[PDB]
Amino acid sequence: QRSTSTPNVH
Amino acid sequence: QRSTSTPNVH
Amino acid sequence: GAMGSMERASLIQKAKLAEQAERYEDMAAFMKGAVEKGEELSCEERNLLSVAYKNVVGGQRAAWRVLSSIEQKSNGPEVREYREKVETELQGVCDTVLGLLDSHLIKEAGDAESRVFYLKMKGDYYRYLAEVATGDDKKRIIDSARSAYQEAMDISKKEMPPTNPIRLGLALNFSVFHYEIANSPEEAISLAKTTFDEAMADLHTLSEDSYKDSTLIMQLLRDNLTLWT
Amino acid sequence: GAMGSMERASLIQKAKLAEQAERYEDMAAFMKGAVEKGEELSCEERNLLSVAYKNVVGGQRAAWRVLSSIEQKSNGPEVREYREKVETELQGVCDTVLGLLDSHLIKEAGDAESRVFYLKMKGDYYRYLAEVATGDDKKRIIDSARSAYQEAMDISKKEMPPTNPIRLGLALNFSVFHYEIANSPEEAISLAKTTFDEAMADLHTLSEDSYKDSTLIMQLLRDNLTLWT
Ligand SMILES: *CC(=O)NCC1CCN(S(=O)(=O)c2ccc(Br)cc2)CC1
Ligand SMILES: *CC(=O)NCC1CCN(S(=O)(=O)c2ccc(Br)cc2)CC1
Ligand SMILES: [Cl-]
Ligand SMILES: [Cl-]
Ligand SMILES: [Cl-]
Ligand SMILES: [Cl-]
Ligand SMILES: [Mg+2]
Ligand SMILES: [Mg+2]
Ligand SMILES: [Mg+2]
Ligand SMILES: [Mg+2]
Ligand SMILES: [Mg+2]
Ligand SMILES: [Mg+2]
Ligand SMILES: [Mg+2]
Ligand SMILES: [Mg+2]
C-alpha cells in the first residue's frame, strides 16, 4: 500500500 | 461485439 | 541491429523482465534480437515472441479502430491524418514480424508444432494488415493470409491431435479470418463447429501441460458460434 | 521540433484524438508541440498536457518499481542493466516536462490558477526524479521539488479557496512528497489533516464546474491519513 497522489481525470 | 481470436496467455 | 552486441541468453532474460514490467515494446525488441541470433526458438521463447508482438499490435489495432470510427462518423484533415499515422505504424510492426518469420523462423525443418505456429503467426499478421488495407494491396494481402493459414491447417491435421492448442488457436484464427476478412460466415461457422466437435470427440488427447489452453480455445470457439448464430 | 509545421489548433485536436485512442505518447508529443507555439494554455489544454505526461511517466514509474523490486530481491547484470534503461527513459521524460515548464509555461504573469498548477507540476516531476535518484543529484532534486511545491502553496493559500482542486491536488501531492521522499510523516500528516479540515470548514466554496474533482481529492486526503495512522 503506497501513498495516493493526484489522479488523472477528464 | 467482435469475433474473438486467440488471446495472450502465460 | 540494436541488440546485436547482447548475448542471446541475456536477451531472453530481459524479454521476461520486460513482460513482468508490462514493457511490451522493449519485450518485442529483445525477442527480435534473440531471433536474429539465428537459432531456433523453444516453446517458452515462442510464447514470449508471440505475447510481445501481439500486445504491441493489439494496442495499435484498438487505436486504429477508435480513430477509424471517429473518421467515418464525421462523414478538417486531422482525424484522417492521425488515423493514417497510426495505420503506418501498425503496418510497420506487421512488416517487422513478417520479416522475422520469412528471414529466420519459418523453415522446412523443425517439428510440426513450430512450423504450424509460425505459419499461423504469418497468417495472423497478414490478417492485421488486411484489416487496414484497401486496393491492389488488399486483394493480395488476403490471399497471403489465407495461403499461410491453409498450409498451417494441412500440417496441423496431419501431425497434431485435435485438442492441441496451436491447432485449436490456428483454427480459431482462420475462422475469424473467414468471418471478418473474407466475408464467408458459412465457411467460418463450418470451420469453428468442426474444430470444436472434433476436439470434443477426441477430448482424451488433452495434454497435462497445456489442457487449460486447449479448453480456453474450445470455449472461445463456442462463443464465436453463439455470436454467429 | 517534429510538430513545428502543424497548426496549434490541429495539435490540440490531435491530442484529444490521441487521448480517445489511449495513445498517450502521441498525445504528449502533440501537447508539447502546442506548448512550443509560445501561447498560454487554457484550463482544458492544461488538462490534456497533464493527462498525457502523467500517463507516460506513470507507466515508466510502475515499470521501474517492478524491476527495482526484482533487483533488490536478488540481493548477472541483466536486471540492473534493464532497470537502468527504464530509469534513463523516465528521467528523459521528466527532463522534457521540466524544460517545457521553465522554457515556456511558468511565468510571473497569468492568473494564479495557471501559476499554481505549473509549479505543482514542476514539484511533481522533480519528485519523480527523486524517486530514482541517489547521491549529489538526490539531495538537490529534493530541494528543487520542495521549493517548487512551497511557492505553489504560498500562492494557492493567498489566491484560491480551500476547496479549489489545484489547491487540493497540490496539497495532496506535497504531503506525499513529505511522507515518501522527505521522510517526514508528521509534516505530511499535518499538511493532509489541515488541508482536509480547511476544505470541510469552507465546504461552501465548492465550484459548480469542479466540485467532483474537489471531493475526490478530499477523499484521497482521508485515505492517506488512514494509511498513515
Ligand atoms: C510451445 C510453443 O510452440 N509455443 C507456445 C505458443 C504460444 C502461442 N500459441 S497460440 O497463439 O496458438 C495460442 C493458443 C492458445 C492460447 Br490459450 C494462447 C495462444 C500456442 C503455442
Ligand atoms: C483548469 C486548469 O487550470 N487545469 C486543469 C488542471 C488539471 C490537473 N490539475 S491537478 O493535477 O491539480 C488535479 C486536481 C484534481 C484532480 Br481529481 C485531478 C487533477 C487540476 C487543474
Ligand atoms: Cl498526425
Ligand atoms: Cl506435414
Ligand atoms: Cl537493457
Ligand atoms: Cl501570490
Ligand atoms: Mg551480432
Ligand atoms: Mg548470443
Ligand atoms: Mg457534417
Ligand atoms: Mg491511408
Ligand atoms: Mg514552427
Ligand atoms: Mg500555430
Ligand atoms: Mg543468491
Ligand atoms: Mg543507475
XYZ file of C-alpha atoms and ligand atoms in Angstrom:
532
model
C 0.000 0.000 0.000
C 1.585 3.190 -1.288
C 0.532 6.802 -0.758
C -2.054 8.109 -3.207
C -1.185 11.253 -5.187
C -3.413 13.240 -7.535
C -5.031 11.017 -10.196
C -5.841 11.643 -13.856
C -9.345 12.921 -14.608
C -11.277 14.248 -17.594
C -19.419 -7.400 -30.349
C -16.480 -8.516 -32.462
C -15.196 -12.022 -33.166
C -12.775 -13.404 -30.593
C -9.363 -14.585 -31.830
C -6.630 -16.341 -29.861
C -5.730 -14.447 -26.661
C -2.410 -13.922 -24.888
C -1.557 -16.416 -22.143
C 1.413 -17.267 -19.937
C 20.505 -4.305 -35.006
C 20.408 -2.520 -31.654
C 20.526 -5.891 -29.839
C 23.476 -7.199 -31.852
C 26.048 -6.965 -29.052
C 23.929 -8.668 -26.366
C 24.137 -12.356 -25.584
C 21.115 -14.424 -26.637
C 20.530 -15.648 -23.080
C 20.553 -12.070 -21.772
C 18.080 -11.088 -24.473
C 15.706 -13.869 -23.346
C 16.215 -12.929 -19.696
C 15.381 -9.294 -20.437
C 12.313 -10.183 -22.518
C 10.995 -11.920 -19.391
C 11.785 -8.902 -17.218
C 10.069 -6.664 -19.772
C 7.000 -8.917 -19.698
C 6.879 -8.680 -15.903
C 7.231 -4.901 -16.254
C 4.493 -4.744 -18.952
C 7.049 -3.078 -21.262
C 5.912 -4.877 -24.375
C 7.753 -2.815 -26.986
C 11.008 -3.492 -25.130
C 9.980 -7.139 -24.798
C 9.370 -7.313 -28.543
C 12.741 -5.657 -29.272
C 14.549 -8.146 -27.017
C 12.816 -11.110 -28.672
C 13.625 -9.770 -32.166
C 17.278 -9.631 -31.090
C 17.029 -13.187 -29.807
C 15.529 -14.366 -33.104
C 18.264 -12.627 -35.064
C 20.898 -14.780 -33.401
C 19.796 -17.412 -35.935
C 18.931 -20.281 -33.571
C 15.561 -21.961 -33.258
C 13.187 -20.856 -30.511
C 11.901 -23.134 -27.753
C 8.194 -23.296 -26.882
C 8.698 -20.867 -23.989
C 10.565 -18.433 -26.261
C 7.903 -18.670 -28.966
C 5.398 -17.641 -26.304
C 7.492 -14.599 -25.385
C 7.753 -13.605 -29.050
C 4.011 -14.085 -29.545
C 2.989 -12.277 -26.354
C 5.255 -9.283 -27.035
C 4.242 -8.536 -30.619
C 0.544 -9.323 -30.091
C 0.485 -6.787 -27.238
C 2.176 -4.142 -29.402
C -0.021 -4.649 -32.456
C -3.118 -5.081 -30.261
C -2.782 -1.571 -28.875
C -2.276 -0.245 -32.399
C -5.360 -2.077 -33.728
C -7.514 -0.753 -30.883
C -6.239 2.782 -31.542
C -6.815 2.459 -35.293
C -10.389 1.271 -34.745
C -11.182 4.196 -32.414
C -9.854 6.690 -34.956
C -11.485 4.926 -37.899
C -14.836 5.096 -36.120
C -14.414 8.823 -35.486
C -13.315 9.249 -39.110
C -16.418 7.593 -40.550
C -18.893 9.097 -38.070
C -17.736 12.522 -39.258
C -18.947 11.518 -42.761
C -10.791 19.096 -41.471
C -7.966 16.669 -42.265
C -6.791 15.986 -38.687
C -8.646 12.704 -37.992
C -7.655 11.169 -41.332
C -4.042 12.327 -40.847
C -3.799 10.893 -37.344
C -5.535 7.675 -38.414
C -3.004 7.315 -41.254
C -0.158 7.843 -38.767
C -1.313 5.010 -36.503
C -2.038 2.886 -39.589
C 1.505 3.328 -40.907
C 2.973 2.371 -37.527
C 0.805 -0.765 -37.396
C 1.844 -1.812 -40.883
C 5.448 -1.245 -39.833
C 5.133 -3.651 -36.927
C 3.399 -6.272 -39.083
C 6.178 -5.918 -41.665
C 8.716 -6.494 -38.904
C 7.019 -9.675 -37.685
C 6.570 -10.990 -41.230
C 10.216 -10.262 -41.987
C 11.382 -12.203 -38.941
C 9.113 -15.073 -39.956
C 10.466 -15.263 -43.510
C 14.095 -14.399 -42.762
C 14.547 -16.534 -39.710
C 11.688 -18.552 -38.271
C 9.737 -20.443 -40.948
C 11.702 -23.447 -42.163
C 11.011 -26.778 -43.813
C 12.776 -28.382 -40.809
C 11.848 -28.261 -37.115
C 8.960 -30.127 -35.591
C 5.368 -29.637 -36.705
C 4.447 -27.601 -33.610
C 6.933 -24.877 -34.518
C 6.129 -24.967 -38.243
C 2.389 -24.658 -37.613
C 2.826 -21.889 -35.061
C 4.914 -19.689 -37.379
C 2.541 -20.190 -40.311
C -0.379 -19.299 -38.030
C 1.593 -16.226 -36.930
C 2.236 -15.342 -40.578
C -1.493 -15.706 -41.265
C -2.359 -13.504 -38.266
C -0.107 -10.579 -39.187
C -1.222 -10.609 -42.817
C -4.766 -10.558 -41.382
C -3.854 -7.499 -39.302
C -2.551 -5.816 -42.462
C -5.792 -6.768 -44.230
C -7.901 -5.055 -41.570
C -6.437 -1.718 -42.773
C -5.903 -2.381 -46.498
C -7.971 -1.095 -49.440
C -6.963 -1.768 -53.061
C -4.450 -3.771 -55.107
C -2.726 -4.378 -51.771
C -5.894 -5.667 -50.083
C -6.707 -8.471 -52.533
C -3.155 -9.823 -52.391
C -2.848 -9.467 -48.598
C -5.979 -11.581 -48.061
C -4.584 -14.326 -50.297
C -1.265 -14.305 -48.436
C -3.189 -14.677 -45.167
C -5.436 -17.477 -46.461
C -2.430 -19.232 -48.016
C -0.427 -19.208 -44.761
C -3.400 -20.358 -42.667
C -4.216 -23.176 -45.092
C -0.695 -24.595 -45.087
C -0.771 -24.425 -41.284
C -4.130 -26.234 -41.251
C -2.910 -29.051 -43.516
C 0.143 -29.729 -41.326
C -1.829 -29.487 -38.077
C -4.478 -32.039 -39.102
C -1.746 -34.464 -40.175
C 0.645 -34.014 -37.233
C -1.250 -32.859 -34.167
C -4.116 -34.152 -32.047
C -7.402 -32.260 -32.373
C -7.029 -30.740 -28.854
C -3.517 -29.343 -29.452
C -3.589 -25.615 -28.512
C -1.674 -24.441 -31.607
C -4.082 -26.468 -33.743
C -7.088 -25.025 -31.922
C -5.764 -21.459 -31.840
C -4.904 -21.623 -35.532
C -8.383 -22.932 -36.389
C -9.994 -20.249 -34.220
C -7.992 -17.547 -36.005
C -8.586 -18.966 -39.505
C -12.318 -18.881 -38.809
C -12.209 -15.254 -37.628
C -10.394 -14.593 -40.910
C -13.289 -16.226 -42.785
C -15.976 -14.249 -40.959
C -14.277 -10.828 -40.743
C -11.795 -10.539 -43.641
C -13.094 -12.958 -46.294
C -16.791 -12.373 -45.561
C -17.645 -16.091 -45.622
C -19.731 -16.619 -42.478
C -20.658 -20.152 -43.577
C -17.011 -21.114 -44.136
C -16.233 -19.640 -40.713
C -19.096 -21.408 -38.932
C -18.244 -24.688 -40.656
C -14.603 -24.467 -39.543
C -15.403 -23.417 -35.976
C -18.114 -26.054 -35.494
C -15.965 -28.818 -36.957
C -12.966 -27.782 -34.857
C -14.918 -27.747 -31.594
C -16.719 -31.026 -32.342
C -13.531 -32.868 -33.275
C -11.836 -31.570 -30.108
C -14.762 -32.909 -28.048
C -14.749 -36.224 -29.899
C -11.072 -36.662 -29.073
C -11.176 -34.947 -25.671
C -8.916 -37.670 -24.252
C -5.973 -36.166 -26.221
C -5.677 -33.176 -23.838
C -2.101 -32.715 -22.635
C -1.201 -32.374 -18.959
C 0.943 -29.326 -19.694
C -1.492 -27.415 -21.935
C -5.073 -28.570 -21.235
C -6.062 -25.189 -19.743
C -5.059 -23.531 -23.026
C -6.982 -26.106 -25.035
C -10.233 -25.755 -23.109
C -9.973 -21.960 -23.263
C -9.862 -22.030 -27.067
C -12.714 -24.542 -27.242
C -14.862 -22.127 -25.226
C -13.806 -19.243 -27.488
C -14.895 -21.369 -30.459
C -18.299 -21.805 -28.737
C -18.556 -18.061 -28.081
C -17.939 -17.268 -31.761
C -20.574 -19.788 -32.856
C -23.121 -18.192 -30.492
C -22.253 -14.769 -31.912
C -22.578 -16.091 -35.470
C -25.877 -17.949 -34.849
C 10.596 20.071 -33.317
C 8.668 17.358 -35.146
C 5.404 19.286 -34.598
C 6.806 22.591 -35.856
C 4.882 22.653 -39.142
C 1.460 21.815 -37.663
C -1.082 24.433 -36.691
C -1.641 24.859 -32.947
C -5.359 24.109 -33.269
C -4.616 20.883 -35.153
C -2.134 19.905 -32.458
C -4.827 20.363 -29.778
C -7.367 18.491 -31.900
C -4.968 15.574 -32.336
C -4.053 15.475 -28.637
C -7.765 14.906 -27.983
C -7.946 12.168 -30.614
C -4.844 10.565 -29.102
C -6.459 10.670 -25.654
C -9.566 8.953 -27.023
C -7.272 6.387 -28.661
C -5.252 5.900 -25.423
C -2.112 6.847 -27.395
C -0.549 8.841 -24.602
C 2.960 9.233 -26.013
C 1.451 10.710 -29.180
C -0.844 12.833 -27.014
C 2.160 14.105 -25.069
C 4.059 14.866 -28.302
C 1.093 16.824 -29.686
C 0.743 18.833 -26.466
C 4.497 19.585 -26.402
C 4.120 20.948 -29.939
C 1.165 23.035 -28.814
C 3.158 24.439 -25.888
C 6.062 25.286 -28.167
C 3.875 27.645 -30.166
C 4.522 30.068 -27.290
C 0.928 30.892 -26.302
C -0.632 30.312 -22.910
C -2.687 27.176 -22.327
C -6.362 27.178 -21.357
C -7.652 25.049 -18.471
C -8.784 22.332 -20.893
C -5.365 22.322 -22.593
C -3.535 22.178 -19.263
C -5.574 19.065 -18.509
C -4.516 17.469 -21.798
C -0.866 18.268 -21.072
C -1.169 16.893 -17.537
C -3.066 13.747 -18.534
C -0.656 12.897 -21.367
C 2.636 13.195 -19.497
C 1.315 11.680 -16.252
C 0.201 8.607 -18.224
C 3.615 8.302 -19.896
C 5.661 8.740 -16.728
C 3.187 6.617 -14.737
C 3.869 3.574 -16.888
C 7.602 4.192 -16.550
C 7.391 4.513 -12.744
C 5.393 1.285 -12.469
C 7.939 -0.498 -14.681
C 10.876 0.907 -12.704
C 9.345 -0.246 -9.416
C 8.782 -3.792 -10.727
C 12.391 -4.022 -11.896
C 13.766 -2.376 -8.760
C 11.922 -4.927 -6.636
C 13.365 -7.800 -8.671
C 16.793 -6.149 -8.450
C 16.763 -5.930 -4.656
C 15.127 -9.319 -4.045
C 18.049 -10.874 -5.924
C 20.344 -9.373 -3.234
C 24.198 -11.443 -13.553
C 23.975 -7.823 -14.714
C 20.741 -8.085 -16.744
C 18.222 -6.808 -14.151
C 20.382 -3.827 -13.181
C 21.027 -3.033 -16.866
C 17.351 -3.174 -17.788
C 16.375 -1.200 -14.679
C 18.914 1.485 -15.651
C 17.441 1.587 -19.170
C 13.915 2.273 -17.914
C 15.339 4.718 -15.354
C 17.131 6.723 -18.047
C 13.960 6.899 -20.147
C 11.955 8.121 -17.142
C 14.499 10.811 -16.347
C 14.358 11.832 -20.001
C 10.615 12.377 -19.856
C 10.867 14.318 -16.586
C 13.588 16.486 -18.138
C 11.274 17.165 -21.068
C 8.383 18.243 -18.838
C 10.649 20.390 -16.659
C 12.128 22.013 -19.754
C 8.693 22.914 -21.095
C 7.783 24.326 -17.690
C 10.866 26.550 -17.470
C 11.138 27.475 -21.150
C 7.508 28.152 -21.814
C 4.885 27.657 -19.132
C 5.928 29.131 -15.773
C 5.654 32.910 -15.828
C 5.242 35.736 -13.350
C 2.094 36.705 -15.313
C -1.090 34.699 -15.918
C -3.710 34.040 -13.301
C -2.968 32.243 -10.045
C -4.654 29.011 -11.180
C -2.162 28.569 -14.013
C 0.843 29.669 -11.944
C -0.004 27.257 -9.126
C -0.680 24.379 -11.499
C 2.685 24.678 -13.279
C 4.609 24.973 -10.008
C 2.767 21.899 -8.711
C 3.673 20.146 -11.973
C 7.300 21.220 -11.536
C 7.222 19.838 -7.987
C 5.711 16.546 -9.199
C 8.286 15.834 -11.907
C 11.204 16.691 -9.632
C 9.567 14.264 -7.172
C 9.501 11.593 -9.888
C 13.211 12.210 -10.497
C 13.806 11.948 -6.739
C 12.171 8.518 -6.586
C 15.099 7.196 -8.684
C 17.979 9.423 -7.525
C 20.873 8.516 -5.203
C 23.719 10.956 -4.480
C 24.735 14.578 -5.086
C 21.815 14.636 -7.523
C 19.318 13.328 -4.953
C 19.842 15.999 -2.285
C 19.473 18.811 -4.820
C 16.483 17.225 -6.597
C 14.540 17.012 -3.320
C 15.192 20.695 -2.623
C 14.048 21.671 -6.118
C 10.843 19.692 -5.532
C 10.208 21.170 -2.072
C 10.999 24.666 -3.370
C 8.508 24.419 -6.259
C 5.764 22.947 -4.056
C 6.259 25.618 -1.390
C 5.967 28.518 -3.822
C 2.826 26.872 -5.206
C 1.437 26.504 -1.670
C 2.055 30.164 -0.786
C 0.236 31.408 -3.905
C -2.640 28.943 -3.510
C -3.425 29.919 0.096
C -3.423 33.598 -0.885
C -5.379 33.348 -4.154
C -7.620 30.296 -4.112
C -10.446 28.979 -1.953
C -9.608 25.965 0.213
C -11.755 23.631 -1.972
C -10.082 24.612 -5.271
C -8.962 21.365 -7.000
C -5.492 22.659 -7.952
C -5.035 23.792 -4.349
C -6.213 20.431 -3.026
C -4.272 18.362 -5.562
C -1.121 20.364 -4.885
C -1.512 19.899 -1.119
C -2.167 16.177 -1.585
C 0.994 15.843 -3.680
C 3.150 17.977 -1.354
C 2.132 15.715 1.520
C 3.019 12.545 -0.410
C 6.369 14.253 -1.011
C 6.747 14.731 2.756
C 5.883 11.126 3.600
C 7.682 9.309 0.755
C 10.599 11.495 -0.406
C 11.432 13.701 2.598
C 10.646 11.059 5.235
C 8.669 13.479 7.424
C 5.469 11.584 8.253
C 4.457 14.228 10.809
C 4.895 17.063 8.298
C 2.856 15.011 5.822
C 0.073 14.190 8.286
C -0.054 17.802 9.465
C -0.422 19.082 5.891
C -3.001 16.482 4.864
C -5.115 16.907 8.009
C -5.031 20.694 7.794
C -5.895 20.638 4.089
C -8.887 18.335 4.542
C -10.176 20.198 7.613
C -9.934 23.613 5.967
C -11.730 22.268 2.877
C -14.537 20.978 5.125
C -14.681 24.234 7.074
C -15.141 26.146 3.831
C -17.149 23.463 2.016
C -19.472 26.157 0.644
C -16.654 27.295 -1.717
C -17.091 24.241 -3.994
C -17.417 25.269 -7.639
C -20.241 24.046 -9.869
C -17.772 23.114 -12.601
C -15.196 21.268 -10.467
C -16.839 20.027 -7.240
C -16.480 16.356 -8.258
C -12.717 16.884 -8.558
C -12.590 18.636 -5.199
C -14.450 15.941 -3.283
C -12.327 13.239 -4.921
C -9.128 14.827 -3.605
C -10.638 15.338 -0.151
C -11.369 11.603 -0.003
C -7.830 10.826 -1.194
C -6.551 13.040 1.633
C -8.666 10.945 4.060
C -7.319 7.701 2.584
C -3.715 8.843 3.092
C -4.423 9.830 6.700
C -5.922 6.378 7.378
C -2.842 4.766 5.829
C -0.553 6.988 7.911
C -2.457 6.461 11.201
C 5.097 -24.388 -27.275
C 5.016 -23.429 -28.457
O 5.417 -23.868 -29.521
N 4.670 -22.147 -28.372
C 3.879 -21.532 -27.330
C 2.816 -20.964 -28.258
C 2.081 -19.766 -27.706
C 1.143 -19.185 -28.742
N 0.346 -20.246 -29.390
S -1.128 -19.797 -29.924
O -1.009 -18.432 -30.341
O -1.548 -20.787 -30.866
C -2.185 -19.862 -28.529
C -3.019 -20.946 -28.339
C -3.835 -20.996 -27.226
C -3.795 -19.959 -26.313
Br -4.919 -20.004 -24.779
C -2.953 -18.880 -26.488
C -2.128 -18.850 -27.593
C 0.425 -21.573 -28.746
C 1.861 -22.055 -28.729
C -8.276 24.435 -15.281
C -6.790 24.121 -15.156
O -6.065 25.076 -14.938
N -6.243 22.930 -15.391
C -6.908 21.648 -15.339
C -5.963 21.026 -14.321
C -5.904 19.517 -14.366
C -4.846 18.991 -13.420
N -4.946 19.642 -12.097
S -4.449 18.745 -10.830
O -3.376 17.926 -11.309
O -4.216 19.649 -9.747
C -5.798 17.707 -10.416
C -6.624 18.029 -9.358
C -7.696 17.213 -9.052
C -7.928 16.088 -9.820
Br -9.392 14.947 -9.409
C -7.116 15.767 -10.890
C -6.061 16.600 -11.198
C -6.167 20.445 -11.884
C -6.249 21.548 -12.919
Cl -0.672 13.169 -37.347
Cl 3.103 -32.164 -42.916
Cl 18.925 -3.294 -21.319
Cl 0.700 35.412 -4.888
Mg 25.546 -9.536 -33.689
Mg 24.404 -14.811 -28.410
Mg -21.210 17.191 -41.049
Mg -4.405 5.892 -45.508
Mg 7.416 26.156 -36.033
Mg 0.077 27.542 -34.937
Mg 21.538 -15.536 -4.143
Mg 21.604 3.500 -12.365
